[PDB]
Amino acid sequence: KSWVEETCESIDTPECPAEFESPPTLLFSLDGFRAEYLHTWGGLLPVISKLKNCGTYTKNMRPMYPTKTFPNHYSIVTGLYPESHGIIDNKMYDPKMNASFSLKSKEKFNPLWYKGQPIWVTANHQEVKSGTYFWPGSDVEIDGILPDIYKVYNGSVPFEERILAVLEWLQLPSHERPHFYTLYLEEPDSSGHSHGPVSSEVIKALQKVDRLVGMLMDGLKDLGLDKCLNLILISDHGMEQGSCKKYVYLNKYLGDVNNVKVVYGPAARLRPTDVPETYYSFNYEALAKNLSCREPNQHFRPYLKPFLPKRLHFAKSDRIEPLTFYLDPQWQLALNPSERKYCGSGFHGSDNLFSNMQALFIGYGPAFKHGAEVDSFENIEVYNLMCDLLGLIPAPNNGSHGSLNHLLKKPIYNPSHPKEEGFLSQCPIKSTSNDLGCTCDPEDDDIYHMTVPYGRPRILLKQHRVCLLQQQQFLTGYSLDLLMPLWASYTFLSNDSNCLYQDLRIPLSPVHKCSYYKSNSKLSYGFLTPPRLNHIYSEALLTSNIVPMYQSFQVIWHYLHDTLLQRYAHERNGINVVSGPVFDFDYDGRYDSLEILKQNSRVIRSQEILIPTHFFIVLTSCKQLSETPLECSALESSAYILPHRPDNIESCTHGKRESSWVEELLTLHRARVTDVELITGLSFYQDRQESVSELLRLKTHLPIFS
Template identity: 60%
Template sequence: MASEAKNGSTGRDMQAEPMLNSLDMAEETVRAAQTRKKKKSSKWKVLSLVICVCILTAILGCIFGLKPSCSREVKSCKNRCFERKFGSCRCDAACVELGNCCLDYKDVCIQPAHVWTCDKLRCGEKRLAGSLCSCSDDCKDTNDCCVNYDSVCRGNKSWVEEKCEDIQTPLCPAGFSRPPVILFSLDGFRAEYLQTWGGLLPVISKLKQCGTYSRSLRPVYPSKTFPNHYSIVTGLYPESHGLVDNKMYDPQRNALFTLRSAEKFHPSWYQGEPVWITAMNHGLKTATFFWPGSDVKINGTYPNFYKEYNGSVPFETRVMSVLKWLRLPEDVRPHFYTLYLEEPDSSGHRHGPVSSAVITALMKVDQLVGLLMDGLKQMNLDKCVDILLLSDHGMEEARCENIAYLTSYINSSNDYMVVYGPAARVRPVQLPDEYFSFDYAGLAKNLSCRKPDQHFKPFLKQHLPKRFHFAKNDRIESLHFYSDPKWQVVKSPEEVKVCNGGFHGSDNRFTNMQALFIGYGPNLKHGLEVQPFENIELYNLMCDLLDIEPAPNNGTHGSLNHLLKHPVYDPTLPKELFEPFQCSVIHGARVKGLGCSCDSLSETGYEKQLTLTPQQESDTKKLNLPYGRPLVLQNSSYCILYHNKYVSGFNYNIKMPMWSSYTLGKNVSTVC
């Protein structure tokens, strides 16, 4: 039984074992499935975590390490201009209308067509069609970089940031066999402007510091734009070169010259030889971007490169054109250049010389001079080119109460008109019939000393101060009005439309008429201030810089040698053939029949007057020969005759003085 029981129990166990195994297997399957599920869940968690980390890394990279490229991609137009690829903002022309342009759209995509400079946003840009210049990485290779590319995009110093350097010989790049010369005019730049506002003009102030500078340049009379610009390039006074004013009449041709008429292009108005023609006559090439007379066929020719005057041409375009000419191949590249800007003259006329508008204009032209200097530096020409930076005249403040009306002194007449201003002239109405026959002298007499406080004086032109050199030309009317400082002469109040602002044209010695002069370059002295001089001397100076022979002119060749490091002209002064001797009184040497009478003073009395002590001779020489004795170049002997009030060079052959020298004391009277 026991055996059976045992066997029975064993049978049940053997039957239960497969059942347990099945349950175990089911449980194992469940547990395995749960384990696989857990592993799969963990795997996804890890994968999700990895993805999150990657996304976070990318975000942090954009924020910190890769911020510029990400922001350019999403928020900047850098290298995306006018592309049809849209990020969070657009850079095509339609974005303006849609209102979803990137913030830098105008700066990066529009401004390059209007400006000649780089900024940080443009550095490394893709070259855009229509851009004035490029800030791309390859602009050096294509020779179209903006002038400040090196300083803004490459980290180099701009020209104004460099220290002054005194060099003894020109440092020119290959292809420049001689230093170019640039004549640069800032119209109406009063000499005082630089002294007063120099702190706002860093570029011009550096040129002054590093170059040759004069506190003022004396214009010719009248101190007007056309006469002075043409005197600068010819070395002639207006009476010699024919441009006697901005408005003038030629009785020979019965023609009227104004700045707005086609008549100004007629070559007959322009006499003398401007420096661009002198240079061309010596085989050099010239280029002018505006200068009075440069767009006229003078002596049958124009400059090799020139522009007909158009005041609307942007100043930057003018400067960049000169730089473009300097990049031409050597066989066609000019040697001489002119550059002209209307400012600060225009602002001075409209608002007066003491105005915020003039200060703004001064700062603008300073930037333009800087544009030129940066361009030269980028071309390695800043130590090669000689530059004359100057102006034609100054500017005076106009006031309505400082106008003298001729109708306040005499009755009005329809027989004549007045070319009004500070150097007013009378012109008959009947032209050309009465141009020479009009009663100028009678009108001058009627207008002389009419009032104690009269602020002008009438002069027949031959009686004007000789220092004006303003008489020997038919285009100068016979009757002239000389005005006090700050004053102008007009025929009647009806002729005045605007009486405030600024004007010029006055006496060329008046302080506010003085002009600017700075010379800078390898052939001009470094850090030198010189005494003021007349602008007619500049023609000879430019010829010396170009190493050419000047045409005949009113200047004194060699008078500006002290501005040059290596003067090319050595003037030889004429010598007297005979040294004068001391005059001695010859008794009885009277000449009869001279048609003159003498007073009752005895011969002994005359001899006493002519016999001076050594001290008296010394005193009269100091007083009456302050600049030394005049030289006599004629083949004739003479003696020096000393008087208490004058000194004479007496010629025994002709029995009369060859010259007399004396000094007039200051007239303290203020009465006419």
């Protein structure tokens, strides 16, 4: 009986043959295996389905941006964002090197492109042999290290020969036998491109890849290793059906120009022709503004590199062009119709939150649970997972180590909460009482636990001075070094102007007085905590609850609290809200140091002001609608990092449908709670009853579009 014909068998304890001390780990990749494939064509894939039913499976695995082979395949083995490991796209360019990158090119084998530290390099430093087969970055030597057994990429090599090659390596002597293995197949990406996600060719491809995996499992069985191997069946990205009618050509707005170069695709980037002579000299801002809101329902959008949604983490790299394009699903962008390969073929590279861009993940073996289905997770989390499977100390990556513990029978690493590095001090009443120049028209522990029911946010800032200011409706973490609130937490239940009051607990600043704010200047102040809470709550009009805010953002901020927030309280039976300013001028996704904060502190209206680049807001509710946010058994989190812009060009307000463009902006700039943590230096939910690993799972979560 073949392996696919046999039923499920619990591998609680690894049954390894002699000469094996511990189960090896094989990374089997199926390029272009969209997540919807297994959802829909499960009855046609008996081998893949059994690995799913007897292993650890996830409906959707979220890949990196852009959704391309090389960036994702390299992000898997490095656990790094594409902006950090160097491989931004299949085709890219480095200005500082004056060299282009391509799959079919000599620059591909240049070690100056590959940053970070892949798993095979990590394994080598800790005396662990590795045998790879056609994995991106295996041909090139990183840090002067090459896998003990490698093969320079040759797509002409038959798949059946690739499997046998790995099977031959598994038989090597105990001292010369690799402990980590990789496998790569071009299917069903190849068939996906030429005929589309919904075709007879992909079905034939899926069945082909399915039988090929069955051959591997039969091969493992004949070697007596079917219950002694950890298998991770993964993919790089999904597949979307392209159309000729749904394509964007830049020439229609620019003309047959030759001063700009466009890397075509659903994730388009733009660089000048005179490069690197005018790589920085070229002002992209004008071109971006000249391309925005040209169509009534435009399916593309010009984005300056720091203005992209933070969830993508696609700014802090030299190779990424300062001008990018975000496109709607099923849409690609190019300069001229000649540059593009084809318009009506299957493509990928779209937003990583799109339904069809989702990838595959199946963990099978003694280390993985049997028939366990978990929630979605990013591919950068797999790096740490493999380190635990190979007994390796992971290199510094972007994955939350320990967040995938629920996949393993016996988890190896037990994570802990980050210690508070902040210098927590107290702010008593000391300075009474200045004139604010404002016109106003006519015990403690119980209120604490009510405002921060999951625990106060911890200050990961080193070594920032923070005070805890308690009110009757909210608790705010105030900064003494920046003289403004870092965060404000409050609970909003299902059903419950030019005037201000001086907070005697904080030092007075010239920007706290209303006389500072005129009706002419676009810059004003906004509240972190809505004043219409619970008559009218007056402590929300405290000076310590205001932050510098553009008038254009107030359009979004008011609708967020006056309309959406109240609706969410009815739908989710109340919400706990934590809000605050975000300062990331270096667009790296992490909080700025005191040094760079002072460099970006503008002066306006004769006063020095540090204005936020973004504003974060985290919404927390109960998974059980019968419970209020003060009595959650399990949490329901959703975070947002909203861009603080002087205007609303990104939204195309023109037509004046306020209720439409705002919600679309919120959903677009949704982010992981971890993303908010990383960019603000705060830690949430530390006093929550669930374990750290569970809380990591919660904070690293993102909803899939469509």
